């Protein structure tokens, strides 16, 4: 048809681009929360491995 | 006069520092551990662990059971986040069978492997 | 998946079940203790 429909499509795609840009930083923030939780659970597992090694030998 | 006590769980640390006396509820009776105690591995009951820090400070953490490992220069408490038990231990297993409510199990042959893997391999490449 | 770095996730398969001058004062029997610790170890590896 003309310029009016194209201008509406541009605004629609622009509104979507703004949130996917924000969601990238939200994913990075949640990645850091998951990485600290990975480190917090290591001492328990390594110590249980150290006990079973002697308790079996 | 003090040892390095570390109360830990599969998810995170509960305590870490220097202590003068550690009081625990063992599976065969209560214990009182102080510096230089002999090597000891033990099963813990669900209840509060009392610690004494140099001097007069008294930490009282509630633990749902676990394992106490002791050595003359280190005290490790491997706690549990939940209270394990034969009914709870079996119920979660039965609920994991029940949750897998599959009308038709199938065979596992899965001969469509390449047709599905290659379609997604090509599609995933075009997107980046 | 394993976290190689912030830009690389590696798909992996890890074996779970099939794994010096003093001894412990085992309160219960050492067999009873080994049975419980091996179960806690496998659950912890799955959680990790």
From Swiss-Prot, chain B:
It is a peripheral membrane protein. Gene3D superfamilies: ATP synthase delta/epsilon subunit, C-terminal domain, F0F1 ATP synthase delta/epsilon subunit, N-terminal. It is found in: Cell inner membrane. GO terms for molecular function: ATP binding; proton-transporting ATP synthase activity, rotational mechanism. GO terms for cellular component: plasma membrane; proton-transporting ATP synthase complex. InterPro entries: ATP_F1_dsu/esu_C_sf (IPR036794), ATP_synth_F1_dsu/esu (IPR001469), ATP_synth_F1_dsu/esu_N (IPR020546), ATP_synth_F1_esu_C (IPR020547), ATPsynth_dsu/esu_N (IPR036771). SUPFAM superfamilies: Epsilon subunit of F1F0-ATP synthase C-terminal domain (SSF46604), Epsilon subunit of F1F0-ATP synthase N-terminal domain (SSF51344). It holds the Pfam family ATP-synt_DE. Its main location: membrane. Keywords: ATP synthesis, Cell inner membrane, Cell membrane, CF(1), Hydrogen ion transport, Ion transport, Membrane, Transport. PANTHER family: ATP SYNTHASE DELTA/EPSILON CHAIN, ATP SYNTHASE EPSILON CHAIN, CHLOROPLASTIC. Produces ATP from ADP in the presence of a proton gradient across the membrane. F-type ATPases have 2 components, CF(1) - the catalytic core - and CF(0) - the membrane proton channel. CF(1) has five subunits: alpha(3), beta(3), gamma(1), delta(1), epsilon(1). CF(0) has three main subunits: a, b and c. HAMAP family: ATP_synth_epsil_bac. Belongs to the ATPase epsilon chain family. This is ATP synthase epsilon chain. It comes from Pseudomonas paraeruginosa (strain DSM 24068 / PA7) (Pseudomonas aeruginosa (strain PA7)).
From Swiss-Prot, chain C:
It comes from the Bacteria. It is found in: Cell inner membrane. Belongs to the ATPase gamma chain family. Produces ATP from ADP in the presence of a proton gradient across the membrane. The gamma chain is believed to be important in regulating ATPase activity and the flow of protons through the CF(0) complex. F-type ATPases have 2 components, CF(1) - the catalytic core - and CF(0) - the membrane proton channel. CF(1) has five subunits: alpha(3), beta(3), gamma(1), delta(1), epsilon(1). CF(0) has three main subunits: a, b and c. This is ATP synthase gamma chain. It comes from Pseudomonas paraeruginosa (strain DSM 24068 / PA7). The gene is atpG. The chain holds residues 173 to 229 of 286 of the full protein.
